[PDB]
Design a protein around this ligand. Structure first.
Ligand SMILES: [Zn+2]
Length: 194
């Protein structure tokens, strides 16, 4: 079945929002977020911290899902996946399917889904409330193809983050645009000038 995943931001009843590190745009930066563009700029396979902020702690058994989609165009119905150079290369972590663009690092409770109905790829982790004295929870995502690998790239790629309960009920949704590139700090600077 076709699908056009919702992009609609929805804090819901726990006040679910995203946060990113304020990393600036030095040469050395591997991952930087633009508030102005609502856009991440990261390197392939590198760490991208994404914070989850909540006004009320959701119940035990809550889960966090990420899915990439093409934001717009004739590509809206196209499942985002890795290119052949990257799909068929030597880089499995033993947990991620080789086609999945998005991975989570450093979590042995990560789970990967090819949807049996829509064929969309997604990655889920358990929601862990922040440690006492911490304000948010952080997930380290890794993006496993560059923006240049993507065939719809008539279209930006959007990461959609959803909070869901143990039964799959949606509690919250947020999203940001994502560029996988050689020089995140330079491309952000450049894109904001534009
Ligand atoms: Zn690729």
């Amino acid at each position: 079945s076709s699908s056009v995943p919702s992009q609609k931001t929805y804090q819901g009843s726990y006040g679910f929002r995203l946060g990113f590190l304020h990393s600036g745009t030095a040469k050395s930066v591997t991952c930087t977020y633009s508030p102005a563009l609502n856009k991440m700029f990261c390197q392939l396979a590198k760490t991208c911290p994404v914070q989850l902020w909540v006004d009320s702690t959701p119940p035990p058994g809550t889960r966090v899902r990420a899915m990439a989609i093409y934001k717009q165009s004739q590509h809206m119905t196209e499942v985002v996946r890795r290119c052949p150079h990257h799909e068929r290369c030597s880089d499995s972590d033993g947990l991620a399917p080789p086609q999945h663009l998005i991975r989570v690092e450093g979590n042995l409770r990560v789970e990967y889904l090819d949807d049996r109905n829509t064929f969309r790829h997604s990655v889920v982790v358990p929601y862990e409330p922040p440690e006492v004295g911490s304000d948010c929870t952080t997930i380290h995502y890794n993006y496993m193809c560059n923006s240049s690998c993507m065939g719809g790239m008539r279209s930006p790629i959007l990461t959609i983050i959803t909070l869901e309960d143990s039964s799959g009920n949606l509690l919250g949704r947020n999203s940001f645009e994502v560029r996988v590139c050689a020089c995140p700090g330079r491309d952000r600077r450049t894109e904001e000038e534009n």
